[PDB]
Design a protein around this ligand. Structure first.
Ligand SMILES: Cc1cc(OC[C@@H](C)c2ccccc2)cc(=O)n1CCOC(=O)NCc1cccc(-c2c[nH]cn2)c1
Lengths: 215, 216
C-alpha cells in the first residue's frame, strides 16, 4: 500500500541490535542517496534521525546508523534502550520532485516474553445470515509485542474492501488481543470456495480458512 | 531539535471550518516554501496532506488548504467531516539539512452522532472444537461514542470468569469496534442450553444468544 516497503515490526531486548529495511525501486531508493529515517513515539511529534542515507542530525546518538544497498536502505539501532521503542518510517526522493514514504516499522523493546497469537476464525453465524449479513471474524489473542498485521484472502485473491481490524489492546493477562472482521454479503460468502485470515506477528504468518457448509 | 509551534487543540462542528497555525523562524518556515502538513489518526500511520506550503498530494480532498505568511504556516480544513478528527503535524526544512516538526494539533470534530452497536455473536467454530477449544466471540461494531460494557450469560446465569473485552478502537467508518470473547471448554459449551452476550451502550442493552448447533 505504501510506496516504499518496510517490515511491519521488529523487536529486541535491551542492549540488543535491530536492523529494519526500506525497499523501493531504482527510481527512488536506488536512484540517489536521499533516504531519510524518522522516529515517532505514538501520539508525539516525529523526529528526523537519518538523512541522506547515513547522516545523523545533531543530538542523535551514533547507536543509529543508516546504510543502503541497491534498492534497499537499512537503519540499524545498536544497543537498544527503552527510549528506542517507537515507530520508524523511511522516505526517499522519487523520480521527479516526488517524496515517497514507507509504511512504518513498530520497534518494540521487549518488556515481557514474546508470545505468538492464538488465531480463531469464525464463519457466519446463523442469525446474521438470516439478516442478510455474512460477516467473518478472526479473533487474535494472547500475543506480545502488541503489533500484528492481518490479511484476508477470498479463495487465493487478496480482499481489501470490507476489512476492519481493531487496534490491539492489552487484556487482563497482560497480553494483547484484537479482532479482524470481513463484512461479506451472503452471496459473496456462498459463492467462493473459502475465505482465509492471515495473521502476521514477529515476522511469522499464521493462516486460518473457513468455507460454507450446508447447515 | 527545537520545535515548530502549533496549538495543542482545535475544533469545529460538522460542515464548519477550522484553521490551525504553525509558527517557525525566518530560517525554517520563513526561509523557503518547504512547509508540509500531515494527518494522523491515533494508532495509524500518518498521511501527508500538504507539501510545499500549498500543494495537495493525489487523493487529498480540496477541503484542505495550506498557506504561509512570514514565519507562520496555516492549514484550513473546510467542510469538516468525522474523518478529519485526528492529529495534524506541520514540518519545515531549515538550513544545515535540518527538519523541524511542530508539536501537533489535535483537531476535534464536535457533536458527532450517537450510534447504537451492531452485535454479532459467534458460536465455536468447527476447527477449535476439534482442537478441544470452545471460544465464543461477541463482535461489537458501528457504535459511538466508544464506550461499552459487556456481560455474558450461561443459560440465564451470569458468567463471572473467562471473559475478555478489547478496548474499543475507531474504524474506517469513524465508529468504534470491539470484541468480547469467552473461553469455554467444549464441555461447558455442550452442557448448557445457550450462551448470551449482553452489550450495554449509553444505557441501552443489546442481547444475542447462541446454542450448540444441531447440524452434522
Ligand atoms: C506511511 C506514510 C508516512 C508518512 O510519514 C511522514 C513523516 C514525516 C511523519 C511521521 C510521523 C508522524 C507524522 C509524519 C507520510 C505519508 O504520507 N505516509 C503515507 C504514504 O502513502 C503512500 O505511500 N501512498 C501512495 C503514494 C504513491 C505515490 C506517490 C505518493 C505521494 C506523492 N506525494 C505524496 N505522496 C503516494
Amino acid at each position: 500500500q505504501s510506496a516504499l516497503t518496510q517490515p511491519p515490526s521488529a523487536s529486541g531486548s535491551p542492549g540488543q541490535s535491530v536492523t529494519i529495511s526500506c525497499t523501493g525501486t531504482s527510481s527512488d531508493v536506488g536512484g540517489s542517496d536521499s533516504v531519510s529515517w524518522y522516529q515517532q513515539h505514538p501520539g508525539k511529534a516525529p523526529k528526523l534521525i537519518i538523512y541522506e542515507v547515513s547522516q545523523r542530525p545533531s543530538g542523535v546518538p551514533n547507536r543509529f546508523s543508516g546504510s543502503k544497498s541497491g534498492n534497499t536502505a537499512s537503519l540499524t539501532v545498536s544497543g537498544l534502550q527503552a527510549e528506542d521503542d517507537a515507530d520508524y518510517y523511511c522516505s526517499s526522493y522519487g523520480g521527479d520532485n516526488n517524496l515517497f514514504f514507507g509504511g512504518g516499522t513498530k520497534v518494540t523493546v521487549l518488556g515481557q516474553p514474546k508470545a505468538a497469537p492464538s488465531v480463531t476464525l469464525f464463519p457466519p453465524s446463523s442469525e446474521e445470515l438470516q439478516a442478510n449479513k455474512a460477516t467473518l471474524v478472526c479473533l487474535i489473542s494472547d500475543f506480545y509485542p502488541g503489533a500484528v498485521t492481518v490479511a484476508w484472502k477470498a479463495d487465493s485473491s487478496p480482499v481489501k474492501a470490507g476489512v476492519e481490524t481493531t487496534t490491539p489492546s492489552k487484556q487482563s493477562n497482560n497480553k494483547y488481543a484484537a479482532s479482524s472482521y470481513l463484512s461479506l454479503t451472503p452471496e459473496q460468502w456462498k459463492s467462493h470456495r473459502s475465505y482465509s485470515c492471515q495473521v502476521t506477528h514477529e515476522g511469522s504468518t499464521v493462516e486460518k480458512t473457513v468455507a460454507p457448509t450446508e447447515c
